Design a protein around this nucleic acid. Structure first.
Ligand SMILES: [Zn+2]
Ligand SMILES: [Zn+2]
Ligand SMILES: [Zn+2]
Lengths: 100, 15, 1189
RNA sequence: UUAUGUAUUUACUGACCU
């Protein structure tokens, strides 16, 4: 995300699998991470959609509910035509909070 | 054009 | 300030062309790409012509295009790879007549990048995968399948990435239901860029590489990788599996090579050069086209060298392995971008410059006479297999499809004294180049002539039965002559024919089976074989006015009005209705039309009255002589017509100045009168038949045909004069047509090219015409022709004589000096066989004064061998008197890459007497190529290149008067408004320069901030300058309101001038605009900037009047970017903002696709606009009606 | 008088977070 600067994206080739967002993060854009003007569906790679990882949230990794989208401001900057935006690592937040 | 709202009759006039 | 783009005659040059069963039937279709346009063409086999069926604007650059057939499939899907990061697979739906987008998958950022794929596109021949690949580093494989709804599906993109790797071409290796393989010519360059010795990048030969897709393992592996002992440029698929020896031919400079992996030894065949063609100092020879063909017995390849010499390559294999390849000189056509040989034996060639062609293949195979050679015959000493070029033997020309690409220079001028202006166009590359004159009318071609004396009023066209075509008679009357001529040969005045009645006649028609009605003073005739006339027409007195006939039913009037019908009996003779209205007089015209069904009355009555009124009356027996719906007209109609034109009955009145087009439906009459104008003599509306349907020829000062070409209502004029009448025509002398004269003669006409907008007429030229000027006294064109790599014909004659010399010198003892003489006096047409190419750095050039009426070389002046013209201006000096002058900027030894001129010249000519010839005056030298000449205040201004010099005449040579040296890189354009100079740099921009009267200085006082690469420009105001660039944009640079000129002459502002000018539009066109001109295309219209691009297209930029129009069309196209996205996926706002962001220009080619959606979308947009879709289509064609065609 | 290194509060940022 933009808030947690240590989160890294997957960035491999985007397949045909449509991204999903959890119930806690519905309406969030994936890159600019806002709520308004969703314009373009999320296509995620086949390694980040395999088996146990199907229909899972792009950001949280929770169980997905609705489809994921990019903003218009991510679309017209063509930040959707890079790799798949599946946030891979879980780092330094929601880990120490689990230990707290 | 017309009298009520100056709409274009465009020649069209009917009963 | 606020503009609006429209294309008038959209682009015609073809870059890619593919063929296949796109409709889904047995017959085949061509799909071509005009670059920005994607078109479907049907090669109509029986008549041989080529008909366009659909043309869409994809708003991208179609970087590659390829059709594929799904495994066990009927229809082929088109596959488009573009500047968007999108593969997009299209299906031609014939029903709705549009390209249904099947799928659209995103794989990288957009624009014509280097890394993301889209440039090269290969497909598996069975139809299971498709590879889209870039010029560097990355390739993608999609796996195509079909699922249970017989529907196409696409997997995730497989990856075939390979770093530091060029790709020259990629192709589908046929393997019959095996793992699909793709072959590509690669090159790895990392050791070529690591070693500064330079030789490591000199021995870095290509590799043929095969990518095999493990469908079992779902990834792409480099299977084979074999180097090449020469650099191949493109590959050709060989069919295989069961059909042939599966592999890839490799075309290359002077070679063709069959390679196939595993076991085939590499088969080399050196490319046949011509016998002793005079274009080779040292130059190789490549192919440019492939054109495979699978004739269900064997397979062959119609390859093509770069001159145009088509070869018939046939693989003849003794084993399952290949044995040896062999080829022969098939034929020669102009050089093509792509070929599609067709089953049913056609050959379509798409010349990249000039006209496209469709040939019928006459002698396929051609295995009878010709000296064919092969690969594996032990021939040494280079090529050693020659061929003598020859005219056509294997092909016959059938269709010449027209194109304006490349429009190199253009003028809007009215030189031929016609009312509307004309487009004078330079066109073509090389010996196929042409000046082309374009008008707005239609191709009115006369096939026969007669000379009808007196002053005839009218003509009518009638047959024996409804079933024939000969059209047995043709009647012509003015007051008292009937003259019902025989239609065929020996057309001459008639005696009392089998249909003739009396002399003073006024109408005719076929009413019954063979029963004619002819009308005169004692009107009623009814004549089938016996002259069964019953001529009453006497309500006491009145006997002549206003005939109005149909095929089954009649309504005629007398002085009075709503009157008699005078029908017939369906088994017998005529009768009448005695129910009359008698209508206080008021009649100028009546007209009707009849339907193809109807065992009843089955028509509608329209009458036009002397008062400012028309009237429609339904005369069905229930509700007879009872008026139905009312009218409005300003002055007087003088004409009426009813017609049906689609596949709503289109009521066409005409008044004495303007014309209308209503939309009368049969029970209810919702009129909706479309309007348009036509001296202004009263128009006359005559229903004729073209192409299969009917239309109205409405006639005035000039004639106007109003025909519905795919429901578009082209109201296009005619190229002939005024003709005062019209009627239909059919005969075996010419199948359909129009006989149309009320003035002193008689013409049988044909309207041949009927879809298009412009009338091309071409005047052929020798070389590539750079630009031309217009001698304004006694209008004549003065053209400079210039071509790199070309001989001037003095060197052609010297080179031919030299060839003859060494052919009679090289051991002639044993003999044939016949060969040298026959070589000297047999001159091949260079427009047919390709011009010879003079190595490098040679430059042919001539100067041609030409009549723009007949198109004849009124004067021709050659130049020397390397002395190439670049700029021309006619002018009239001030120090000398009235006499004209011609200034021609010439360069010498230019060599254009790397650029090293040897300094140029400026020739001065006098252009005596009327302008018909051209006397030399003097020859001044100059130290860099004078690429811009411009008359200014009785002198000239010459851009030497970084140097702007004023000049004046001397009797020895030209004399400079000023000079400037602060203008940047290179001059390419100079235009003046008077007291100001606009200097177009070749790289930066427009530079304003002031010229002083008291001094002689040239002071730069304004420039622009953007680098632009300006190609041409035009002045619009005293301040603004509209210009265009090499990349495709159009800028308009308006000076700020202050910018005081008075600057007398060290810091600049940003390393430039001080008053930075500013930009008030940027717009992308996709093609290089080469001619911008401010003009008015239709009298009664308005000014509009006209751009003529390089790829043949012609467009306009149109200002908006008021902010309601601007805001309306802005919301229209802002809705259409949402509802109607472009075909390639290329985002329309980000196509028009390709290099610079768009500003204040509304793309009206997106707007005029409002008329191309299904009416659900149209109702969504129109109620989102709060209008109705006919109201929006009216408002949307008003602008094209007003400013343009 | 710009300035460092640190012990060190106070303010402030990211629609950060059950
Ligand atoms: Zn966003
Ligand atoms: Zn991923
Ligand atoms: Zn989430």
């Amino acid at each position: 995300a933009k808030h947690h600067p240590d989160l890294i994206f997957c960035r491999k080739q985007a397949g045909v699998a449509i991204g999903r967002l959890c119930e806690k993060c519905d309406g969030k854009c994936v890159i600019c991470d806002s709520y308004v003007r969703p314009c373009t569906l999320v296509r995620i790679c086949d390694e980040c959609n395999y088996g146990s990882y199907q229909g899972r949230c792009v950001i949280c990794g929770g169980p997905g509910v609705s489809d994921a989208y990019y903003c218009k401001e991510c679309t017209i900057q063509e930040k959707d035509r890079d790799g798949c935006p599946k946030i891979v690592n879980l780092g330094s937040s929601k880990t120490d909070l689990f230990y707290e | 054009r017309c009298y009520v709202c100056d709409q274009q009759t465009n020649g069209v006039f009917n009963p | 300030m606020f503009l609006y783009n429209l294309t008038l005659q959209r682009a015609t040059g073809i870059s890619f062309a593919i063929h296949g069963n796109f409709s889904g039937t047995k017959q085949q279709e061509i799909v071509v790409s005009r670059g920005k346009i994607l078109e479907l063409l049907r090669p109509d086999p029986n008549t041989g012509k080529v008909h366009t069926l659909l043309t869409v604007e994809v708003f991208g650059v179609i970087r590659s295009l390829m059709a594929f057939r799904l495994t066990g499939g009927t229809k082929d899907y088109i596959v488009v790879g573009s500047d968007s990061g999108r593969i997009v697979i299209l299906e031609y739906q014939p029903s709705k007549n549009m390209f249904e987008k099947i799928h659209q998958e995103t794989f990288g950022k957009s624009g014509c990048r280097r890394i993301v794929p889209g440039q090269f596109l290969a497909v598996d021949p069975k139809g299971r995968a498709v590879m889209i690949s870039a010029i560097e580093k990355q390739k993608l494989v999609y796996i195509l399948n079909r699922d249970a709804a017989a529907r196409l599906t696409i997997s995730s993109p497989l990856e075939a990435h390979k770093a530091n790797t060029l790709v020259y071409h990629v192709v589908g290796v046929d393997v019959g239901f095996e793992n699909p393989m793709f072959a590509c010519l690669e090159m790895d360059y990392e050791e070529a860029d690591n070693d500064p010795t330079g030789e490591a990048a000199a021995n870095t030969q290509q590799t043929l590489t095969f990518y095999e897709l493990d469908l079992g393992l779902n990834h792409v592996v480099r299977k084979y990788s074999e180097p090449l002992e020469e650099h191949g440029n493109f590959l050709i698929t060989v069919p295989g599996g069961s059909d042939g020896p599966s592999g890839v031919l490799i075309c290359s400079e002077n070679y063709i090579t069959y390679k196939n992996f595993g076991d085939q030894p590499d088969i080399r065949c050196p490319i046949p050069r011509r016998r002793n063609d005079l274009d080779d100092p040292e130059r190789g020879m490549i192919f440019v086209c492939s054109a495979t063909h699978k004739t269900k017995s064997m397979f062959f390849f119609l390859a093509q060298t770069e001159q145009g010499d088509i070869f018939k390559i046939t693989l003849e294999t003794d084993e399952d392995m290949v044995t040896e390849i062999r080829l022969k000189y098939f034929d020669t056509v102009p050089v093509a971008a792509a070929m599609c040989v067709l089953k049913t034996g056609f050959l379509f060639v798409a010349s990249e410059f000039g006209n496209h062609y469709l040939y019928q293949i006459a002698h396929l195979g051609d295995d009878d006479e010709e000296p064919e050679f092969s690969s594996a015959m032990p021939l040494e000493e280079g090529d050693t297999f020659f061929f003598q070029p020859r005219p056509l033997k294997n092909l016959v020309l059938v269709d010449e499809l027209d194109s304006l690409s490349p429009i190199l220079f253009c003028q809007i001028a009215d030189l031929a004294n016609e009312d509307t202006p004309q487009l004078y166009v330079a066109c073509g590359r090389g010996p196929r180049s042409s000046l082309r004159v374009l008008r707005h009318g239609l191709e009115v071609s006369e096939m026969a002539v007669s000379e009808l004396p007196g002053n005839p009023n009218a003509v009518w066209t009638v047959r024996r039965h409804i079933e024939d075509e000969f059209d047995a008679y043709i009647i012509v009357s003015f007051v008292n002559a009937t003259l019902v001529l025989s239609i065929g040969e020996t057309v001459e005045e008639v005696t009392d024919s089998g249909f003739l009645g009396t002399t003073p006649t006024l109408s005719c028609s076929l009413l019954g089976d063979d029963a004619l009605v002819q009308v005169y003073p004692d009107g009623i005739r009814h004549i089938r074989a016996d002259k069964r006339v019953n001529e009453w027409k006497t309500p006491g007195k009145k006997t002549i006015v206003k005939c109005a006939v149909n095929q089954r039913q009649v309504v005629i009037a007398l002085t009075g009005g709503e009157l008699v019908y005078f029908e017939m009996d369906p088994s017998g003779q005529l009768n009448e209705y005695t129910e009359r209205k008698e209508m206080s007089a008021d009649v100028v015209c009546m007209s009707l039309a009849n339907v193809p069904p109807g065992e009843q009355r089955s028509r509608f009555l329209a009458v036009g009255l002397v008062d400012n009124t028309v009237r429609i009356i339904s005369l069905d027996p229930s509700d007879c002589l009872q008026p139905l719906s009312m009218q409005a007209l300003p002055a007087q109609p003088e004409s009426l017509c009813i017609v049906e034109m689609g596949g709503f009955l289109y009521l066409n009145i005409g008044l004495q100045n303007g014309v209308l087009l209503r939309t009368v439906l049969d029970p209810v009459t919702g009129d909706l009168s479309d309007t348009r104008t036509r001296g202004s003599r009263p128009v006359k509306l005559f229903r004729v038949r073209m192409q299969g349907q009917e239309a109205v020829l409405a006639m005035s000062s000039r004639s106007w045909l109003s025909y519905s070409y795919q429901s578009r209502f082209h109201l296009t004029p005619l190229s002939y004069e005024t003709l005062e009448f019209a009627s239909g025509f059919a005969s075996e002398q010419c199948p359909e047509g129009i006989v149309a004269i009320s003035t002193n003669t008689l013409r049988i006409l044909a309207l041949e090219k009927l879809g298009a907008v412009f009338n091309q007429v071409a005047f052929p030229l020798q070389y590539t015409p750079r630009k031309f000027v217009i001698h304004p006294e006694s209008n004549n064109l003065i053209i400079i022709e210039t071509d790199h790599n070309a001989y001037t014909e003095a060197t052609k004659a010297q080179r031919k004589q030299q060839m003859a010399e060494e052919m009679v010198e090289a051991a002639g003892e044993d003999l044939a000096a016949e060969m040298a003489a026959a070589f000297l006096n047999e001159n091949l047409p260079e427009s047919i066989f390709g011009a010879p190419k003079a190595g490098n750095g040679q430059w042919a050039s001539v100067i041609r004064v030409m009549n723009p009426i007949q198109g004849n070389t009124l004067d021709l002046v050659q130049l020397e061998q390397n002395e190439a013209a670049f700029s021309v201006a006619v002018c009239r000096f001030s120090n000398t008197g009235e006499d004209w002058y011609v200034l021609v900027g010439v360069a010498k030894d230019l060599i254009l890459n790397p650029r090293s001129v040897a300094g140029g010249f400026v020739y001065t000519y006098k252009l005596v007497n009327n302008g018909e010839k051209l006397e030399f005056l003097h020859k001044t030298p100059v130290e860099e190529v004078p690429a811009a000449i411009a008359p200014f205040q009785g002198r000239v201004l010459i851009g030497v290149g970084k140097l702007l010099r004023v000049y004046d005449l001397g009797k020895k040579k030209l004399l400079r008067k000023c000079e400037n040296k602060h203008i940047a890189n290179y001059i390419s354009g100079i235009q003046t408004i008077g007291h100001r100079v606009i200097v177009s740099d070749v790289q930066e921009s427009f530079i304003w320069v002031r010229y002083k009267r008291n001094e002689n200085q040239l002071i730069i006082f304004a420039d622009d901030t953007y680098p632009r690469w300006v190609t041409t420009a035009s002045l619009l105001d005293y301040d603004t300058v509209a210009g265009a660039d090499k990349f495709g944009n159009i800028c308009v640079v308006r000076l700020p309101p202050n910018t005081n000129d008075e600057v007398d002459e060290d810091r600049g502002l940003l390393n430039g001038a001080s008053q930075k000018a500013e930009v008030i539009m940027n717009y992308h066109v996709g093609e290089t605009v080469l001619s911008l001109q401010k003009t008015t295309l239709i009298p009664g219209g308005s000014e509009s900037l006209v751009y003529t691009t390089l790829s043949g297209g012609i467009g306009i930029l149109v200002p908006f009047t008021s902010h309601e129009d601007h805001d309306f069309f802005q919301h229209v196209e802002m809705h259409l970017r949402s509802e109607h996205p472009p075909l390639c996926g290329r985002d329309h706002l980000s196509f028009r903002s390709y290099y610079f962001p768009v500003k204040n220009v509304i793309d009206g080619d997106l707007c005029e696709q409002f008329n191309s959606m299904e009416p659900n979308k149209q109702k969504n947009v129109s109620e989102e606009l709060d209008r109705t879709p006919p109201e929006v289509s009216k408002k949307l064609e008003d602008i094209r009606t007003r400013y343009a065609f």
